[PDB]
Design a protein around this ligand. Structure first.
Ligand SMILES: [Zn+2]
Ligand SMILES: [Zn+2]
Ligand SMILES: [Zn+2]
Ligand SMILES: [Zn+2]
Ligand SMILES: [Zn+2]
Lengths: 262, 262
């Protein structure tokens, strides 16, 4: 049963807000944590773990272990893979002809069956009560249609499970908001970010696939691909927006949003 | 140019020999290091990193970072990927219809482009002069034919490269050589190890694909799959055995072997 979806950022400021917009953002993330505290498991889609051009990753390793923070911000901790659910996701994707790989590491069981986590996962996880997880990774060379279809099949698996599951979508938006930022300034970053927030807030996420590659290439978001998977899941489980917040304290846009069962 | 091939173990005793057989093994491993000291890059096939059922992995991440030693033996260190060579291997496998994935992590380049190393890589690397590496991973659910073809295609890439390249195959053999080991004692471990050393020493590795599933299942080696890839490379680049050694100090077979161009 898919009882909620949380769109969560993976920027360090979310953990240490320095302005009122980022504080409101953190408030939403804390509310996501509260909303999902009675989940049995989480499914987490992250763009900053393993990245394959043309296959969606399903991590099978037993132990998910903090490894790589952003800009030296270490968030130590260990989570456990929900192996049964991970296998269900992988098998459903295989059956639906969605390109996917089953990712084990070192050993297939025991303490050596482990997989590294990065800030892409660790920052959202700071706000959530510890539960077993399935870590999934998007693939940027898959078509919009394939990503949406992957989300639909994912939603089927999560909804059909006897477990109460929350879907966590880790995503930051345009990365060129400041001339002094690492990607410099591009006006398209704000265009993308404002569009995403309108789609979220006005419950118009069905328009996500219509965003042209041109805007995406220029805006430099990380969010688009996993948000298409999210849209697919929303096709199978009616949800409603509870709240949302956007903040851009430095050079990149961050959003938090909570949807619950309608 | 494929300059040579080194079969190397990934057991802790190889780094700290406590008997004559293991000392002889370490000598061969040191000879491999010496023989390949003038190489430009290494290609390393390991069974204890990422493991996908049905796709060969090509690690693209820029920085290869020690993460997971075996049984407390940490071997800290950092290596760099030969990204140009890694791309050549991936592209050639794709072209030849060898199932393969391009494995990036966190970021496509720069500081966060990092991939974890385990004892499967770190132990052989202790014997080699530091050079850029391409890390590859076998897949145990691919057919013998596909694994051999993958090695043939790999051999062609390494041979056609302007660089002087050594292929390193990380491999331990049967794992049931001691009643007190994690798998107890099984005569099939001896049978498999004896056969592998026979095929190496008599230069009859062409017989590798004839080893029955039952023997492999009972002997519990990790070596078989990557040795089939190795065989494929030998198909394309004629090599000759220089030296070999076997040791089984604890519960698992280890071999070192050096082949150079015929
Ligand atoms: Zn990001
Ligand atoms: Zn409007
Ligand atoms: Zn595939
Ligand atoms: Zn091993
Ligand atoms: Zn014989």
């Amino acid at each position: 049963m898919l009882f909620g979806i949380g769109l969560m950022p993976h920027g360090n400021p979310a953990l240490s807000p320095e302005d009122k917009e980022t504080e409101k953002l953190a408030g939403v993330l804390k509310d996501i944590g509260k909303a999902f505290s009675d989940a049995d498991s989480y499914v987490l889609i992250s763009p900053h773990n393993v990245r394959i051009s043309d296959h969606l990753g399903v991590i099978m390793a037993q132990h998910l272990i903090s490894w790589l923070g952003f800009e030296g911000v270490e968030l130590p901790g260990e989570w456990e893979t929900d192996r049964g659910l991970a296998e269900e996701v992988y098998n459903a994707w295989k059956g639906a002809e969605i390109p996917t790989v089953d990712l084990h590491f070192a050993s297939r069981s025991g303490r050596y069956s482990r997989w590294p986590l990065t800030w892409g996962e660790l920052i959202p996880l700071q706000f959530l009560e510890k539960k077993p997880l399935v870590l999934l990774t998007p693939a940027r060379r898959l078509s919009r249609e394939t990503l949406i279809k992957a989300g639909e099949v994912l939603g089927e698996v999560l909804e059909g499970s006897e477990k109460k599951i929350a879907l966590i979508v880790s995503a930051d938006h345009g990365h060129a908001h400041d001339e002094n930022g690492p990607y410099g300034y591009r006006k398209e970053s704000e265009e993308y970010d404002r569009l995403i927030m309108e789609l979220i807030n006005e419950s118009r996420l069905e328009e996500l696939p219509e965003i042209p590659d041109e805007l995406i290439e220029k805006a430099l978001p990380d969010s688009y691909w996993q948000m298409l998977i999210m849209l697919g899941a929303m096709h199978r489980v009616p949800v409603k927006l509870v709240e949302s917040a956007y903040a851009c304290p430095t050079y990149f846009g961050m959003a938090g949003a909570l949807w619950v069962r309608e």
